[PDB]
Design a protein around this ligand. Structure first.
Ligand SMILES: O=C(CCCCCCC(=O)Nc1ccccc1)NO
Ligand SMILES: [Zn+2]
Length: 258
């Protein structure tokens, strides 16, 4: 029926509605660290989040997202492999039912407990809907989460999840600073790929940071209390909302570091 992460509607079914699922630049991928090539040409990345304006937090039935005002150049990503300016629209997470799975990208086949995606769109296309129709329309910053010490900058998110438990719920989420989600190092791998949910459009320059952030067990347990269902339907925990690694095909993953 409609897509999701279950046995009957999960990633192995998506190609019937979205044939690009078997396309030439699908995401996520396994990052083989010994095959990625250091690219001395890659320009230094620029994450400019000081004027970011968060708006709302939303359970969309597949993840939860924090949305930003992207009607002006307030929070932008530039540099790295990117040409031009990419505006932050929203961030969301993918996570597991257990700490050994949950990420979408893997590193030498290792799965992390979760993966944060900070979604940005190329301002030369004017709006996100036009950007998703372009091969360089989006830039997604991917950040792995491992379980250990708490991430203080994540706590304001986790504390409001009770208020968006089920699909369709949203809440006001102003003055949230996404800089509190970033690791120390901006070393990264990059490759051309796609959205990891339907419609799987092949419009993303992926920038995946090498350094994970640590979150606590209590923080990730609160992610796993969300529901895929809407208020009143059989309760199905929102866990394992990740797509597995797809074939690399004719792509090379580049590293910003030696
Ligand atoms: O695919 C991903 C990462 C990138 C997600 C892109 C979502 C962009 C968004 O919020 N707006 C949008 C999406 C599709 C079509 C039009 C707008 N994770 O699953
Ligand atoms: Zn995502």
């Amino acid at each position: 029926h409609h897509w999701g992460y279950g046995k009957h509607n999960g990633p192995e079914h998506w190609h019937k509605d979205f044939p690009i699922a078997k396309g030439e630049r699908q995401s996520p991928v396994d990052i083989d660290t010994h095959t990625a090539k250091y690219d001395p040409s890659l320009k230094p990345l620029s994450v400019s989040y000081d004027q970011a304006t968060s708006l709302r937090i939303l359970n969309n039935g597949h993840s939860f997202q924090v949305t930003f005002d992207d009607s002006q150049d307030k929070a932008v990503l530039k540099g790295g492999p990117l040409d031009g300016t990419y505006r932050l629209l929203q961030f969301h997470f993918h996570w597991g039912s257990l700490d050994g799975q949950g990420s979408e990208h893997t590193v030498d086949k290792k799965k992390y407990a979760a993966e944060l995606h900070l979604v940005h769109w190329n301002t030369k296309y004017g709006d996100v809907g036009k950007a998703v129709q372009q091969p360089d329309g989006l830039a997604v910053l991917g950040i792995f989460l491992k379980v250990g010490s708490a991430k203080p900058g994540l706590q304001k998110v986790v504390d409001v999840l009770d208020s968006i438990k089920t699909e369709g719920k949203s809440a006001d989420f102003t003055n949230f600073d996404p800089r509190g989600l970033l690791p120390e190092s901006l070393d990264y791998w990059t490759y051309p790929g796609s959205l990891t949910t339907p419609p799987l459009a092949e419009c993303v320059t992926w920038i995946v940071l090498k350094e994970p952030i640590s979150v606590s067990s209590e923080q990730v347990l609160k992610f796993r209390k969300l529901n895929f269902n809407g208020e009143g339907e059989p309760e199905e925990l929102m866990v394992d909302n990740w797509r597995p690694a797809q074939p690399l095909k004719n792509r090379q993953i580049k590293a910003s570091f030696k």
